[PDB]
Design a protein around this ligand. Structure first.
Ligand SMILES: [K+]
Ligand SMILES: [K+]
Ligand SMILES: [K+]
Ligand SMILES: [K+]
Ligand SMILES: [K+]
Ligand SMILES: [K+]
Ligand SMILES: [K+]
Ligand SMILES: [Mg+2]
Ligand SMILES: [Mg+2]
Ligand SMILES: [Mg+2]
Ligand SMILES: [Mg+2]
Ligand SMILES: [Mg+2]
Ligand SMILES: [Mg+2]
Ligand SMILES: [Mg+2]
Ligand SMILES: [Mg+2]
Ligand SMILES: [Mg+2]
Ligand SMILES: [Mg+2]
Ligand SMILES: [Mg+2]
Ligand SMILES: [Mg+2]
Ligand SMILES: [Mg+2]
Ligand SMILES: [Mg+2]
Ligand SMILES: [Mg+2]
Ligand SMILES: [Mg+2]
Ligand SMILES: [Mg+2]
Ligand SMILES: [Mg+2]
Ligand SMILES: [Mg+2]
Ligand SMILES: [Mg+2]
Ligand SMILES: [Mg+2]
Ligand SMILES: [Mg+2]
Ligand SMILES: [Mg+2]
Ligand SMILES: [Mg+2]
Ligand SMILES: [Mg+2]
Ligand SMILES: [Mg+2]
Ligand SMILES: [Mg+2]
Ligand SMILES: [Mg+2]
Ligand SMILES: [Mg+2]
Lengths: 61, 49, 65
RNA sequence: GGCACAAGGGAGCUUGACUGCGAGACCUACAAGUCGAGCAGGGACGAAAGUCGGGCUUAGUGAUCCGGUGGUUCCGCAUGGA
RNA sequence: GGGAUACUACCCUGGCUGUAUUGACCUUCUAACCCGCCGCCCUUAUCGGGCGGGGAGACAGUGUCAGGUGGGCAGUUUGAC
RNA sequence: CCUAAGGUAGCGAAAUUCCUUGUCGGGUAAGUUCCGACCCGCACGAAAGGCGCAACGAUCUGGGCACUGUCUCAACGAGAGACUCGGUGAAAUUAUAGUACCUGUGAAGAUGCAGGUUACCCGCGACAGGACGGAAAGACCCCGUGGAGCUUUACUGCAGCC
RNA sequence: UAGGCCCAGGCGACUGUUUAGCAAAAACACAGGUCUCUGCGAAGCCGUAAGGCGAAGUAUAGGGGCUGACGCCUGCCCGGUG
RNA sequence: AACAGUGGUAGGAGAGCGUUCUAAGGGCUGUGAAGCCAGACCGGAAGGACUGGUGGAGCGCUUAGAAGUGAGAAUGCCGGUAUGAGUAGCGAAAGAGGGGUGAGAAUCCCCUCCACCGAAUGCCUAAGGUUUCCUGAGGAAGGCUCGUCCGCUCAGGGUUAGU
RNA sequence: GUGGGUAGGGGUGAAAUGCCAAUCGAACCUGGAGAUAGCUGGUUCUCUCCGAAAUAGCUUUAGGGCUAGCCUCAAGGUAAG
RNA sequence: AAGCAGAAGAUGCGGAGCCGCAGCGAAAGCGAGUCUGAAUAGGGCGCAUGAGUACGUGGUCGUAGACCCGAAACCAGGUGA
RNA sequence: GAGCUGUAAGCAAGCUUUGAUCCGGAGAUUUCCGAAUGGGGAAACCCACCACUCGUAAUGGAGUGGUAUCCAUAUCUGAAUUCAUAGGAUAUGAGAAGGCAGACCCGGGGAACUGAAACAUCUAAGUACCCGGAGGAAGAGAAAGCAAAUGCGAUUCCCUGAGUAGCGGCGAGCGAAACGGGAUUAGCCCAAACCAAGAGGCUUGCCUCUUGGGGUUGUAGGACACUCUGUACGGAGUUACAAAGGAACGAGGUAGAUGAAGAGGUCUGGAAAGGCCCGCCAUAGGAGGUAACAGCCCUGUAGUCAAAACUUCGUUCUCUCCUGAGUGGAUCCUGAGUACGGCGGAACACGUGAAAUUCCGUCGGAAUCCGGGAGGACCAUCUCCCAAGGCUAAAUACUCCCUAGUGACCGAUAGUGAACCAGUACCGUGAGGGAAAGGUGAAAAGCACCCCGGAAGGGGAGUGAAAGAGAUCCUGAAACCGUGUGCC
């Protein structure tokens, strides 16, 4: 799924709000990005959120 | 409800505010003190007991 | 469940010593050009809730001391 | 509906087209609406009595909520402010 | 003449160059990302993955935010005597 | 004068013409229909196509011939029901009913009320005038601050798209 | 057991299709005409996405709108809306 | 006691009857309880007794308490039974007679003739049914009549693959 | 004919809003759910005391509602009607 | 009251809390007064003219389906070619 | 401890004091389907491979065991590609899968009808529903807390605060918390500084990673220095604070045992448990049954006992584990893409509002002890705490089920849909919907025999208290259907 393998950031639900305050359901996506990282010490390319990449601890291969 | 005629409360304006720091005192009139005996020091602790 | 006070009324009325309700006058918000000073002096004072209305709404203020 | 001791016409000075009110009444389901002597403050006119809280009377207006503005010996979420 | 001329001290107007920043824009590049292109391997496999070329490339795609459009769809409104 | 421009060809009382059975001609003894013309096109018209058109049509429309019980105007015969007997045996409906006619009265249209008239008791085969007959809480109309489907330059939104 | 026929007109060219159970028709479809989108990961469509139809096709192809065989034709207006 | 009053819808107020259960007292009942069925009794009403018949083991009374407490109507729900009514209908069609069986025969069996289908109303074989198939026995129900008969009831039995 | 596929804010439609299990302008079943109904129908024993209204005002109000008027019970004033 | 002892009881304990005896004001606050007001004025609301509280029965009301029956519909999850 | 071979009659054949049937504990067996798992499949069926075994000359046939996928562990190989890695093979696994209790709990998604007398903000409601994770409970929890006192001292739940403060087309409505009274109580462990060891990058005297020690807090604590002290004398513990194991004993659960006192007399009666007259027992006058109502007839009850085996709890012992005080203020440590902020939402009773506090997506982005957070915008002062790591029992919620019981609960149209062969019959393609139906008698003593009849059904005779109790068999109302006739 569109869930960050490292931080777990995934889609979350909430409301959209019009000016008249009408509420309708919507989701917030994680900013997931295809990157090569170590998965069990074996470099696989998986989806990681930009935020998890921001640090730099998540090293690309 | 008044059938659609504007209800009384809605016709009238709201008034005032509530003070958070409002103090209420337990009042005692002089007639109440008369119940005690002479020379007694009437404190709130004595009154409450 | 407890009977719930009518909150709109609680903001508008006040119980007097003998249990009457004190209220403000209407027509005291604006358009004061269109009202004589006599009206304004009188509308400025408080009034009591009428007997007819009091019975209709007495229960709305039951929880209020 | 009233008005010719004018409420109609003219002239002098002025701002009562006042502030706090208000016994008691009319009208009225309520909300409102109407009249009011008299009291106090400080004034206009008048020599004084006295009259003046708009207009000869009765239409010319819109609740609450929510905002704007001015004033304020009110409140201010520990305290001083805000 | 309003003001005096040398020279020096400190400054302004205008323009120019350079140093260092600051964006905006222009091209170009390759390593991100993309390939519903080719070759090899996993592998008897028109999927997927790995490797090597090629193309494209800082765009696109996607996330967050914003504006416009939007009866495609949806909830409703559309007076009394 | 106005407009962006003012309808051309063709067709026209038409699946379109209200007035209207338009007027004229034909068809009939008699033709609001039909056919041929005319054109004052209420309110035709050129790809929501215009005007023609052989073939086709359980299409719509008018007229002839053949043919006939469609009709004048009904008659007879056959079979199946009906009818009688033996066997078997429902249903809708139903406030209780010993349930006439006339005029009137009445929530204004009576088997049931009033005043008259008429009527011995019980069935069978038939007809449908009434029981405002049965069936289906009227679909018409109006109302409800009822519903649903649809529309849009109604309001407020959402997807999609830029 | 086995077509009634003829004349004339309207509509649709035609065979075909349609409201199972009140409408078979002039309605739909149709071959033909035209407009428009689409350079291929095509446009369009289904799905949140992956994955698909389009298409194992490639502008003489594919999608969408309108018209509806054939014959003769299809005039004027780009101000408004797209 | 006197005087006066006493129609009534919506509605307000009062006093009661009755049903089920509980408590406490006091009883009834196999010498017959409750229920049911009669009757010509009693009370102002809701209602309550008494007697007899049926019934065959539970039930009143007094005071108080608690409620699933009172039905004639809701095109009410369920059950039972009526009316229509001995009425409609008995579901396309050729049967007749002679024997047999039997408690009983238009209807079952056999015989004869006749009649109908015969591009089917014949033969085979699907899907589907699932024992309906065969033999013997039966006539409660089912069979739109009847029934000795049946695709029904009761007993048995019956389906054989290297192709 | 057989075996399959498309499912309801959907499918399928040579298009009739047609068809999707005798149901279709939005299938059927269960649940929210005893939806809501200012509307219609129904609301069960008896007697006694008293006994209306069908009006005014306001109302997205008019066959609904609210206040007043008119009824009833209780307590006061009392004799004011 | 919860709670702790106790027969699923009565009861005992439990004084936190609740209502009333003081009201007036929007409030600071003052207090048989208080608010308005410049005011020992007038007026409003109060006091003098005082009874509340706990429990039970009954009437009515609020929130619950709320006296009973009745929609056409809406939504959610499924079942059907 | 004397009969038994179920309902369930019947016939048949048998078993049992050498102890059956029956009751309880623990084992064995347990076809096929089902997560179903060797493969397939239209569940309950079909077809295989590998070992071993039966059988045949052999094929064909049969029995037992193994053979799913994922995950974990070990081993062997290792592509494109050189080392490698991916991948593949083998072995080892009481690892996972699925179900449900229609409940309770924590989360992911999340309506509409309805209310507002319309309706969109709002309400209904974070409800119904779908999905995931679980546990016997779950969640929360040991202060960056509540407060404003000569303060309190984790969390949870009950009472109260209070329908208050507040929120709100300030409409309909929504609605706290703290203090106070109670139930229950319980606290702990890491990260970092530092020490020791070891290893790889040598980044080259530095660094990272890995082990053990150390250490856990706020008017600061710890490291680090100083002393004092223990090293088990003593303390704790498997419910947190480390983690398993074993005994002895006690009290229970899962069958049972024992257990007082009248056939008292007499009266009806089919039958006494009833009536009348007398007794007696009682730590037993609960209850059911017995031919009408039983403390003394039966099973029982009160009371006192009982377990080969399995199981629950408790207490001791064994066992296991374990140092904690004071003084320093040189330096060092005290949780970073974190806190927090903008933008978009959500949760807080609190609808963006003056909006503190908490959570999510996106982007930006601190201080770090001279530090940091909160006290409802925000600043200053003061007060109280020390976030960005984890664990933690009890009080609480719920009941499908087990045991024992209770009811001013129902008594066959009631009470569960279901008292009865009921989720059945029937209806539907399916999801699904969904009934009706209790009573002979005390005992079958269930009508021998005779008569009419083919039988059914009757009439006698018998049984019985009663057959007008004869199988839809207690009672037997009304509608409705008949027969006879007193009056018309
Ligand atoms: K719409
Ligand atoms: K007959
Ligand atoms: K008559
Ligand atoms: K009639
Ligand atoms: K008797
Ligand atoms: K399906
Ligand atoms: K009964
Ligand atoms: Mg709505
Ligand atoms: Mg109207
Ligand atoms: Mg043109
Ligand atoms: Mg046209
Ligand atoms: Mg055109
Ligand atoms: Mg045309
Ligand atoms: Mg007849
Ligand atoms: Mg008349
Ligand atoms: Mg008449
Ligand atoms: Mg009607
Ligand atoms: Mg045609
Ligand atoms: Mg045709
Ligand atoms: Mg039709
Ligand atoms: Mg037809
Ligand atoms: Mg066309
Ligand atoms: Mg009742
Ligand atoms: Mg008849
Ligand atoms: Mg026949
Ligand atoms: Mg046969
Ligand atoms: Mg028969
Ligand atoms: Mg259908
Ligand atoms: Mg609801
Ligand atoms: Mg209005
Ligand atoms: Mg509403
Ligand atoms: Mg014994
Ligand atoms: Mg004994
Ligand atoms: Mg007996
Ligand atoms: Mg029942
Ligand atoms: Mg009996």
């Amino acid at each position: 799924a569109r869930k960050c393998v490292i931080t777990g950031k995934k889609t979350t639900a909430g409301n959209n709000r019009s000016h008249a305050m009408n509420a309708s359901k919507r989701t917030w996506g994680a900013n997931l990005q295809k990157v090569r990282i170590l998965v069990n010490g074996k470099p696989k390319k998986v989806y990681v959120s930009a935020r998890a990449l921001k640090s730099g601890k998540v090293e690309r291969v | 409800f008044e059938g659609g005629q504007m209800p009384l409360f809605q016709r009238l304006p709201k008034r005032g505010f509530t003070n958070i720091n409002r103090k209420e005192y337990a009042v005692v009139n002089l007639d109440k003190l008369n119940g005690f005996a002479e020379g007694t020091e009437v404190t709130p602790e004595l009154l409450l007991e | 469940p407890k009977m719930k006070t009518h909150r709109g009324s609680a903001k508008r009325f006040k119980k007097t010593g003998s249990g009457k309700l004190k209220r403000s006058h209407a027509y005291t918000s604006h358009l004061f050009a269109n009202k004589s000073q006599k009206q304004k002096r009188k509308l400025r004072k408080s009034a009591v809730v009428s007997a007819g209305d009091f019975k209709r709404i007495k229960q709305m203020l039951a929880n209020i001391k």
